[PDB]
Design a protein around this ligand. Structure first.
Ligand SMILES: Cn1cnc2c(NCc3ccccc3)nc(NCCO)nc21
Length: 280
């Protein structure tokens, strides 16, 4: 819009291009998102404008002008993906990884309690500040209105009425990635994605996942793989970390751990809030 000096295109995703912009009037630097108009989209958004939390990127303003929608968000200095790319030679220390996951579970727990799902978590929409805080960006736009890597298996198998459990799956995937410095399931197609999950956690069945064989995209023709030990999957992570991850990656959406429950896991017993050395 004309109230902003679009100083840069910091990115672009499923819902449009995001720009680092300065408010011509307030002088503040904000993240301007040009959304790519449904009275309902508008109404879902208004709800999001009102959901505030320390671990959720704040939606400052909604500009519905000339039948166009722009979302104005607070600006954060870096995203997790870039930060991990910088740390790839030494990894993000466990204390920082632990603090980040803890904060992320709090954000998720706040949203999930309001029946708000993200549905598209990935390192790129996790933003961090020099203060050691991390926040979830784009929360709830999915309902208001492409890497398959963090996609929950029930979504891959055709489930249309998915739950908050899809976010815990995504988070578990990210958690593993920070630990090993390599993506857990780097799938290049929905079926490749699905068989990558199967080769590591083993092909699901009625025992571990009752109802699985009746899923829409489920085919009796799927290969049967065996489950690998987690010690081999996330070699560096301790027992507490592995049991937590295990619970986040349960096939059955109803058996997969909740964000609130995860906060009480013994893995977070020695959590602290260290500060990251960011290069801006
Ligand atoms: C809604 N929002 C608030 N701050 C940011 C931010 N800040 C990080 C940032 C700063 C400068 C250049 C690139 C990214 N990055 C992005 N998208 C980046 C994911 O590719 N959106 C943001």
């Amino acid at each position: 819009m004309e109230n902003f000096q679009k100083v840069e295109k910091i990115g672009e995703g499923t819902y449009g291009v995001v720009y680092k912009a300065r408010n011509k009037l307030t002088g503040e630097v904000v993240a301007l998102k040009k959304i790519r108009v449904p009275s309902t989209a508008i109404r879902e958004i208004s709800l999001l404008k009102e959901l505030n939390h320390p671990n959720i990127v704040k939606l400052l303003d909604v500009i519905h002008t000339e039948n166009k929608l722009y979302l104005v968000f607070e600006f954060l200095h870096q995203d997790l993906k870039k930060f991990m790319d910088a740390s790839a030679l030494t990894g993000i220390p466990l204390p920082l990884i632990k603090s980040y996951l803890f904060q992320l579970l709090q954000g998720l727990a706040f949203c999930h309690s309001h029946r708000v799902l993200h549905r598209d978590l990935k390192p790129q929409n996790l933003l961090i500040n020099t203060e050691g805080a991390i926040k979830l960006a784009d929360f709830g736009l999915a309902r208001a209105f492409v890497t398959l890597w963090y996609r929950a298996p029930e979504i891959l198998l055709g489930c249309k009425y998915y739950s908050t459990a899809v976010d815990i799956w995504s988070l578990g995937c990210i958690f593993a990635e920070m630990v090993t410095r390599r993506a857990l399931f780097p799938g290049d197609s929905e079926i490749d994605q699905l068989f990558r999950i199967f080769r590591t956690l083993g092909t699901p069945d009625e025992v571990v996942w009752p109802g699985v064989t009746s899923m829409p995209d489920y085919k009796p023709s799927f290969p049967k793989w065996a489950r690998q030990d987690f010690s081999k999957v996330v070699p560096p992570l301790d027992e507490d970390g592995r049991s937590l991850l295990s619970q986040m990656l349960h096939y059955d959406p109803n058996k997969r751990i909740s964000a609130k429950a995860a906060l009480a896991h013994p893995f977070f017993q020695d959590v602290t809030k260290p500060v990251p050395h960011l290069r801006l």
